[model samples]
Every structure is written in C-alpha cells, then in structure tokens.
Target: QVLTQTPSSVSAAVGGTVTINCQASQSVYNKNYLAWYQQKPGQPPKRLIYSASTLASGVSSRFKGSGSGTQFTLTISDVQCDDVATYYCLGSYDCNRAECHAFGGGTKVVVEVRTVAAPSVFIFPPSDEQLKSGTASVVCLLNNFYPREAKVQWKVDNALQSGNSQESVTEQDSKDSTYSLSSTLTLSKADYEKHKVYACEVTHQGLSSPVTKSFNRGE
Candidate 1:
C-alpha cells in the first residue's frame, strides 16, 4: 500500500512556515528509505529529501524532512511565494520480505498574496466590425496580480459555456513582482444568438471570493 498524506492542501503567507505529514500503512522498513519530492505542473518531480532527513544537494536549508517508524513530515520554513507546488512523500514497505517503495498522494501548497493583490479585471465584448468579419470574440483581462495563477471561467446568462477555450497570456512584471493575464474566448459568428449576459469569473488566491466582470454582448 502507498503512504498517506495528511491535510491534502494548505496555505501560507510569505515568509511563513508549513508542514506536511505522511503516514505509512505499516511500519517503515528503514528510515533511510523515506524520501520527499516537489512537483510542479507540467514538470517532472524534483527530489527534495532522501535517506529520511538528508537535504538534497543545492537545496535550500529552509526545507527539512524528518520521520521514523510509520510517521514522516516535510516542513518548509520561511516559505516564499515561488514555493507554490505539490509535495510528495516516499517510503518503503516490506510485506513478503520484498522491499517496495510507497508513495503518498501529494500535498499542495498555496502561497497567500497580499490583500490588494486581486486582479483588476476587465471584460470586453465583440465589436460590430468583428461580427461582420465573421470572427466574433469575448476578451477578458486579469491584470496586476501576484502568485501568477488564477482559475478562469466563462458564463452566459449565468450558465457555464461549453465547447469553448481561451487564449491565455501571462505577462510578468519583475519590478512589482506581479503578473498580468488575458483570456480571450473566441466564438463563431453564429454564436451569441441570444446575447443575455456574458461574464468572466476569476478566482485568485488573494480574493475572498471569485471576482466577476459582466458585459452585454448586444452592446
């Protein structure tokens, strides 16, 4: 059986600390067999801890791993904004005298942004000229936010749209350490037959709730 991770997700402010726990189904065969990994989206996992508590080479001392028996922990001290990712735990089990590696369900870390870090959202509707050109579209802009991630959603008349995709662009601002995002939803000329209400819903870590910007397609 695989190791189990506790508190599947957690949030921490900048320069804060967070710890993740892992428990094996049974007693661990050895402390040196435990490991931890950090994984990012669309990227391969990176080994963080090995031999139970030894830090990987070049790894910052802020990350620490410790465990014995069936319990293990990976703690990140003075967490930074860029430390947003998932962490996994690995250990070994011996049931039939065969050593097998066990993996935990990863724990996700979300670095909290400042209170004013919410995006300055704007929604623009397709123009008459574009409609005549047979390339209608609705564009959304999410600007001036940090942590560089947001959940984007589009709805018409309060109903979630289907069969639509957005062209997303992320612009970085190293000066302010902020990010700007754009999501353009292209629609067919025949679409928007009943232009009721178009909305762009953005969920960012800094906001207490989703921020929605509305636009009337008929305009």
Candidate 2:
C-alpha cells in the first residue's frame, strides 16, 4: 500500500513553527516502526526520527514525531533558515498478506523571510506608431523582492482595471535568493489616451501598505 502526505508545500515564518502530516492507506501494526527523514537540496536524505518520537542520534531536539496507525505528524519548533528542506515519512507494516514498507510523498517546508525589500518597478510603453494604430502595449516589471510571493494591482485614472493583462511567472535570483515578477497590460489607443494615471501597486506581506508606481499617459 502507498502512503500519502497532504499539502506538498508549507510556508512558515522564521523563528516560528510548523506541522507536517502523513497518512497511510492501511493500518500500521507497529507505530514504533515509523521513521522520518529530512532531505535538503542536493544532499542525501538524513533520518531525523525513528520509532515514532525517538530522536535519531546527533539530531537536534527541535524535531518531534507523533501519531499512530494510519495518521502521523511531524512538528518543527523554532524553525530556522537551515530547516528549509523536504520532509518524508516512512512506515513499515504487514499488508495484503505480505510485509511491506512505504514512504509518504515529500512535503517541502519553506521559511518565509519577513524582511522583504520593496520591488523596483519599470514601465515600457508602446511606440508612437503603435498608439496611432489604435493598440498599445505596456509592460510593468517588479524586480528583486524576497519571499518569492506578491500581488500586482493595476489602475487607470485612479480606478481599478481588471482585464487585458498578462503576468509572468515569478523567477528566482540564485545569487541573493530574491524573486522577480513581470506583467503586461494591453490597452486600446482610445482607452490609453482617455485615462491619465496608469499605475501598478505591489502588495506583499512584509509591507504595511502596497507600494505603487505610476506613469502619466503622455509623459
């Protein structure tokens, strides 16, 4: 039988805590036969707990495992930067008239960096000929923010604009572990000239309010 883990990824704040769950299809006869492991990027998986709650040798006390039968949980207390990794649970049991062992699908634990910097915004407007042709293209770039997650809001003439926009997938910067997001808002020449204020508002958890950048139509 196969075991499953819920929520393939979990986000937790630094110096906080998180709990990951694992479930099995069949009943586990011996709860003491369960084990948990942590796998970091490009490194081999390290066993952190065995026999359910028993800590593995040389492991820190921050990790705790609990549960019985088909339901199990692993908790991390006082999460730190180095605790960012994929965690898995393994169970040894007898099923379908044979002894078997199975591992739950891994759950990735991401530590959220609360000190995210504001993103730098850039605008690329359509050429004069394109605007004269009755269609215009505008691109807004949001660059270099931490935590890799944010929202972008568009406004025209101080009113929210909801349609005719495309957003790029967030990309990561390997050097400093920051992220970048880009979006494009398409507009007709009439709408472009009709509205005076064009703005992009960036919303992130680290900031108290949205950071905004605006551009004038004929500027």
Candidate 3:
C-alpha cells in the first residue's frame, strides 16, 4: 500500500487552524501501525497521536486525529507562534494480510507573527483585605492585547521600583484569541500614604512606545 500526502508546507497566523492529511490508496489501517508526529523547526519529532486516534501524553487537547478506511487527518487549533515546524504520518500498510512500515512525505508548517495591538491598562486598588496595617497593594489590569508577549513593570513616584521580586502576574486568554494580563505590586503602607504615585507599564513588539497607566496613593 502506498500513502498519498502533499503540501510542501503550510502557512498560518496565531489562533488559526492547520491540518495535514495522510491517505493510503487502500486498506483500513491498523491502529498500532499508524502514528502522527510534530517537530519544531529546531527540535526533534514528538509524537502527538498514536494508535491512530489515541493522543500522546502531555499533548494539548487542541490536536485532533481522525480517520477511517484508507484516509486520516491530523489537525491543530489556536495555531500558536511555536507551531511552526514539520508534521509526519509514520505508519505501515497492510497488504493481503502482510504489513510493512512506511512513511508519507512530511508537511512543514510555518506560523506567521500576529499583528500586535496594545492592551487596555487600568489600576485596581486593593479590596477588603487590602487595608493591611503594614502593606498596601495595587493591581494593574491589561486587557485585549494581541500577539501574547507582554512585559510588565511597576514604578513608584518617578523612581523605578526594582521590586518585581514581589510582583505577582497572571495572564488570561479570550475565545477570539486576544490576551489579558494582571499584575499586583505590593508596597509598604508608609510609602502608600506618603503621596507617592504608582504606575504600571507594559512593553510589547510593534508598539511605538510602551503603553502605561498610573495610580496615586495619597493620605
């Protein structure tokens, strides 16, 4: 049996989807004989699906493998930037109760860098437990950004706070593929009530300048 595969390469942007096909001229291929692998441009191949429909360990749920009779499809969603690489359907064909290992041509996938859009930045003063006698906290919310690489920093009263050792950051993802980020900066109550100002700045590619937001702590 001979497998049919094509597309020397595929190109897509972040959040998009990609699919590769493996077709055998004939035969309902055996599960153990069929497997799919993924290889980054600089990394070795890692099997994504094995035994045809069974997914490999630690593999993301975004990968879909489906097939029947003589054809199969391996697909991935959310096309991340790191998705660029090669994919292979390495398997064997059963010929008249006889079987032999075989591999169809591999498909190269190239992911395009997504256009960057700066996110909305806002400051959130501490809530209930925020009334600490010794400590004060302010949170920064960055929303609706594109491309997903965001760098956050905090500054106090025109002085750069080399205090990120206490910064707590988290990122959220939207269905439309946009990104959101949150960062919490903690300061001493003495500084918080000393007319000091706090600021949150995020840096990303494609932005003319870093987008920033400021918050003031006053007695």
Candidate 4:
C-alpha cells in the first residue's frame, strides 16, 4: 500500500518538539514492519526508527517513533539545527503476489531562525524608447523572503494575466539564506497603454495577506 505524510513541511523553534505523521491505505501485518528515516540535503537517508518505536543503533534519544496499524508518528523531542532535513516513513506489507515496501511522500522540518519576512516588490515598465517600437515588457521583482517558497502573479486593470509571462527560478542569498524571484510579462505598447493599472501580487506562507505592488505607465 502507498504511504502518505501530512503537513509536507513544518517549522519549529529551537528546542521545540514536532510530530510528523504517516498513514497507509490498509493495515500492516506487523508493527515491526514500519520504519522511519531522515535524509539530509546532500546525504543518503539514515534509518532512525524500526519496528515502530525502536530507535536505530547509535541514534540520538531526541528522536522517537511510535504507532501501529494504519497510522504512525515520528517525533523530535528537542529540535536542533542539525535536525533540519526531510523525514520519511516506510511500511512493509504482504500482497497477493509478493511482499512490498512503500515510502511516505516525506515531511520537511525546518528550524525556525527568525520571523518570516514578506517580499519586497518592484515593477519596472518598458523604457520610453521601447514604447515607440510597438512592443514593451514589464518586470516584477520579489526579494528578501524567507523559507524560499512563494508565488507571484500579474494583473492588468485588476484582471489576472497569464501565458507569455516568464518567471525566473528562485535564487537564494548565501549570506542570509533569503530568496528572490523575478517575473517578466511581455505585451504590445498599445495594450500596455490601454491598461490603466498593473500590479504584482506575491503570496507566501509568512504573509497573512498577499503583498501587492501597483504601477502605472508613467512610472
């Protein structure tokens, strides 16, 4: 049976405890058939728990695993900086044809360092010279965000715009680990002049409401 993990990503303060859950479509034959693993960014996965609650040899006491039947949980008693990684749960079961092992989608646990920051938004309209060429472009920049996950959208006259819009891959700052993203929307000069208002909307987990930046042709 396929296994699944909820709350794909979680954040906790230092010394805090967090629980990651795993669920299966059907019951497992033996509780010992379940296992949990921790995978670091550039390293292979390390087994942390086996037979449900038994910690693997040499693992820290801070990590614990427990559960049976179709549900299980992996809990970190006191989270640490080094505990930042992806966690997975595996289940072994007997099928009509053969025994099989399935892994959960995985849960990413991040150690919270500072408060989440909203992105700084900017909109750059086409240069005056480009407006004479009949074609122009608008660039939207979202920077200085934490957690590295955010979405950007474009709107013209309060209406959503899509297609022909190019979004760059996210870039991270080495100094502070913040993230930045840039999106460019192509349009004809006539269309740009026709739309009275253009806006860049950013959505991130940290923000209660979307951060928006509006612009006009003159700006």
Candidate 5:
C-alpha cells in the first residue's frame, strides 16, 4: 500500500489549542490502531498514538487523538511553549494489520518569544521523580534570547551524545529584534532512570561562556 502524508505549522498562545489533520493515501476502514509522535529540536521522536484514540501510556493527557477510518486528527489542548514543536500521525496498512505503519509529514507549532532577554537559560527533562514511571518520555526546552548564530548540543553525564535538536531565528515583536531558540532531547524512561545529568549547552559568538543547563530524572 502507498502512504502519503502532509504536515502544517501553527502558532498559538499558551492555553490555546492547535489542530493538525492527517490524510492517508488509502482508506483504513474497520481497522483499530493509530499513533502520534512529537518532535522538538535536538530530540528523537516519541510515540504518542496507538489503537485509534487511546493515548499511549505515559503521555500527557493534554494531547488528544481522534477520528476514524482513513481520516484522523491530533490536537494539543492548552498549548504551552514546551508544546511548540512538531507532531505527526501514524497508522497501519489496514488497521488490523501491523505490517505497514507509517508517519505523516508533521506540523510545527510556533510561539512568539516575549522579549529579547539576555540568554538566561533553563533546561528540562526535569529533575523530578514523576518521569521515571517506566513509560514516560522526557525532553528539554530552551527559551528567551536573541541570536548571533549559535548551536545547541546535548551531553549525557558530561559526555557528548548524538540525538535530535532543532534551531531557528525569528523576528520578534520589537525593533531590531530577534528571538533565539528552543530544543528538546527525547529520552526513554530507562535512560531517565539511569542517567545523572543531561545537559544542553548553547554556543555562540561574544559569549564569556557557553550557556548551559542540566537535568536530573530522579531528585
């Protein structure tokens, strides 16, 4: 079976909702499985959907999936800056069969950076016990700064590791204004339970030092 997918982008304020649609190249009538995924800068993708409308365990309830047959929708209710990334839809060849699961293109959700504050930074994959629940997925977010060309990197226990990350520079709502960036590192629950410090370091020009933030999975 041939599967074709298209993605879109949306910008919304916190506490609002953004909707994305996924169309299949063929009908999946009377089948019962579907999945969703989220991708942020510097992170791997996480599975958010399975079995048509039933959320995968360990995901936030704020993300909802619905629809039937070949047409489906993924919605983020009460969106946060942390939620401002990309999302995708997945489904099987015939719903009853598992041989042909495929992902939709994706949709990006963008939010305006409030001010061009100096690169004061914060990192996530938060230092809390709640994420070690065996099925939880973790990610880090960076925000509030202007750009002069920079890159974000991830480290595990101070050693460099390869993962997914995203970067962008957008004009902000002020004169001569630009907004720096945000990214994520998608972690499996197993990694979160075992690792000590997961750091995101931002490197740029004219910096006395690189801006860095660290996270602990259980603290």
Candidate 6:
C-alpha cells in the first residue's frame, strides 16, 4: 500500500537549523524498517537512514537523526551549501525478510539566495482565477521541464506549513520533446480560510536561481 506525508518543503537561512517531520499511517515495530534517502540536483538517491536513525555508511557525519516510535525528525546540525536537495523517510511495516520498504514524501531544503529577477513560478490546473474555497487539494504539474530535478512547494497566506509531496514523473511525451511531472498538497476542511497561496517552483542548473510562482484561493 502507499503511505503519504505532507509539508515537503522546509526553508532555512544560511547556517540556520531546519527540521523535517515524518509520520507513518500505522504503528511500526520490529518487523518494520526505516530509511532515509537524499537526492541532489541531477543525482540518484542515496540512503541516509537505515534501521531508523543509524547513519548510512559514507554519509556526512554532519547530518543526524533522532526520534523513536511513529514520529521522527531528520536534522542537520549545521546546514551547508551541499546540504540543499531533497530528503525522504522510508519504512517497511512488514520486513518480509526481503523487499518491504516504503518512502515518505520528500522534504526539500532550499538555501536563501539573492537574485535579480524574481524566480519565475507557475501554478496549475492552469488558470488566472484564484483557487476556490471549497476545493479539496491543489496539484502542481510541471510540463516540458528540462534537465529534470525540480522541487514543488505549497504555502498558506505567507507562512510555510506542511503537507506537500515530492514531484514525480507522470509520463513522457516523446512527440513533444518534453515530459510531465506532478506533486500534490492536501488540505482539510478547516484549512479553507487559513490557506491562501499555492506555489510551484523549478530549480535546475540551467536557471541562475529557482523559478517560483504562487496562487490564492477565491471565496
């Protein structure tokens, strides 16, 4: 089965601390295993957590994890330039003695940077109209995106909340020389008034800085 978590984006100023929290759908026991992975721009994923908090071999000692039971946090004692990328938590409730691991929605850490042009952001289910109040959720779809590894984000009013997932490839369209990718942000009924802006951003080597865009909901 698929298990999901939210608030996939975390922001920190240079040399600041940021925490990403993860939770499972159900309780985990001995039969389960927890793992964390790191994927930097244009690179494959690297395991960061094994058996729930022990650091994987060769990973930077600077990165650390703490927590037990259902909730956990992956913390970087000192954030560095290279630490920017995506972070994910995975677990397997049924070890099965083989192949029973699941990955959490990745948390993206972005470093504060100065820029000349505002990061170009795009919003989808594309429309100029702000989102409606009663809508269930917002899905950010990136199309024809190049060089691959882009991060997606969601926000409420001006503050960053939690509950956004990492972007995934939906499909490739060879006919158009482009591919389509998507990620989602889920909200509850009570969040209607609290949430105002929904955003999607693209970070790649081609761009000098990340391109970001945002939207607001209509009542």
Each model's total of backbone clashes: 0, 0, 0, 0, 9, 8
Tens-digit per-residue lDDT, 1-219, candidate 3: 566666657767778898888886655455446788887644688989877778999998888888866678888898875666678887765565645766668887766545667777788765546665677778888777766677888877877767552443332232344567778787677767775677887787746799888866542
- What lDDT does candidate 1 reach at residue 137? 82
lDDT of 2 by residue, 150-197 (tens): 898888887887878989854333244467888888988887888778
Comparing 3 and 6 on TM-score, the stronger one: 3
Q: Which candidate would rank higher by lDDT, 2 or 5?
A: 2
- Candidate 5 backbone overlaps, count: 9
All candidates: TM-score = 0.69, 0.57, 0.52, 0.56, 0.51, 0.49
In candidate 5, which residue ranges exceed 4 Å CA deviation?
A: 1-7, 94-99, 113-178, 181-219
lDDT of 5: 0.65
Winning model by TM-score: 1
RMSD in angstroms between candidate 3 and the native structure over all alpha carbons: 10.0
> Which regions of candidate 3 are displaced past 4 Å?
1-11, 14-73, 77-113, 127-129, 165-174
Model 4 TM-score (2 dp)? 0.56
**Model 2 worst lDDT window (10 residues):** 169-178
User: Which regions of candidate 6 are displaced past 4 Å?
Assistant: 1-3, 95-99, 114-219
**Which 10-residue window in model 5 sums to the lowest lDDT?**
169-178
Which candidate, 3 or 5, has the higher lDDT? 3
The model with the greater TM-score, 1 or 5, is 1
Task: State the lDDT of candidate 1 residue by residue for 8-48, as single tens digits.
Answer: 99878778999999988777776457889998766799998
lDDT of 2: 0.81
lDDT of each: 0.81, 0.81, 0.72, 0.83, 0.65, 0.62
Candidate 6: residue 34 Cα off by (Å)? 1.1
TM-score of 1: 0.69
lDDT of 3 at 151: 84
